Structures are given as C-alpha cells and as structure tokens.
Design a protein around this ligand. Structure first.
Ligand code: APC
Ligand code: MG
Ligand code: MG
Length: 154
C-alpha cells in the first residue's frame, strides 16, 4: 500500500536550482512514486559554490529499497549527463524518512542518521513535515528544528 516518505536533495555545482528541479522531475516520473510536496530552497554558506537544499514529500508504493535504487539512478542520471569532463558530483538524494519505519541495513539507514544535527535538512523539512515523527528520537520535526543563521532562504 501507499507510503509517505521524505527525501533530501542537495546540489552545489552548475545551475544548482536546475539540478534540483530536474531531480524532482525525474523522481515524479518513476512508476510507484509521486511528488506531493516540496519545501522552499535554502542556501548554506571554501571557494566552491554554496549548497542549495530542499526536501520533498512523496507518496510511494515502492519498498524502501526500490526507492533507494530510484534515488541513486537519479543521482547517476544527472551526473552522467554533466557537461564538465570530470568534477564533483552534481546531486545528492538522501532518504530522510519512510513512513514511521526504522531501517538498519549496511546499505541503508532510515531515518537518515544525521538529519537531526543538520539545519539544512531540518529547516526545509519543517516547512513540509512539521508534525511528522522521527522514530529514533520519537520527536516531531518541529520539535527538532533549530535556528541556524548560515541557512538562508534562496
Ligand atoms: N537514508 C539514506 N539515503 C540515501 N542513501 C543512503 C541512506 N542510508 C545509507 N545510504 C547509502 O550510502 C551510500 C552513500 O552515498 P552518498 O550519497 O555519497 C552519502 P552522502 O549523502 O554524500 O553523505 P550523508 O549520508 O552524510 O548525507 C549510498 O549508496 C546508500 O546506499
Ligand atoms: Mg548527503
Ligand atoms: Mg547520500
């Protein structure tokens, strides 16, 4: 049946905003995934560009492992098609939450085990998932989010 999940997307190279918008486009077009909500974008502040990050709410009929493959194929797709002969990767797609489930595999940890210490994740996530419970801490997102001045709305 249909599960609600949250993804975190980040990019700090090229047309960063396009990367993010293209990742969302691709994800929305996999079978078993539809994008139901999108956070605003945030910028986070040595000489390489700042990250843009956002969070995405999806409704999916996929298993969390199938969802992981979709995320990685999306990273892979955008990367392969980059102009620049080599360089740092263009896009990170991380699974933040999958229902209220906890998953501990070598290849997969959900909830993302570092989300709670990252404002560039929590702040955008709080814009679309304030009342969702993070099952490890058993706190809601809105109870975890904190102010961080280095994270600005873009
Ligand atoms: N919640 C999650 N979302 C996505 N990948 C995860 C994950 N938990 C574990 N992984 C695994 O970690 C591997 C690492 O890929 P990367 O994207 O380069 C880690 P990262 O996002 O750069 O750092 P981070 O995990 O601290 O954000 C993936 O191939 C995947 O199998
Ligand atoms: Mg990451
Ligand atoms: Mg990752």
């Amino acid at each position: 049946h249909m599960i609600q999940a949250y993804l975190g997307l980040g990019s700090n190279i090229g047309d960063r905003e396009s990367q993010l918008n293209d990742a969302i486009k691709i994800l929305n077009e996999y079978d078993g995934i539809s994008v139901s909500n999108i956070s605003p974008i945030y910028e986070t502040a040595t000489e390489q560009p700042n990250f843009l990050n956002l969070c995405v709410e999806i409704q999916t009929t996929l298993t969390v492992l199938q969802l992981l493959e979709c995320c990685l194929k999306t990273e892979e797709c955008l990367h392969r098609i980059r102009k620049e002969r080599w360089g740092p990767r263009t896009l990170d797609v991380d699974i933040l939450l999958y229902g209220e489930e906890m998953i501990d595999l070598p290849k997969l940890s959900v909830p993302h085990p570092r989300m709670n210490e990252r404002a560039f994740v929590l702040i955008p996530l709080n814009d679309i998932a304030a009342n969702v419970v993070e099952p490890r801490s058993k706190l809601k997102v809105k109870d975890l989010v904190f102010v961080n001045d280095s994270v600005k709305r873009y």
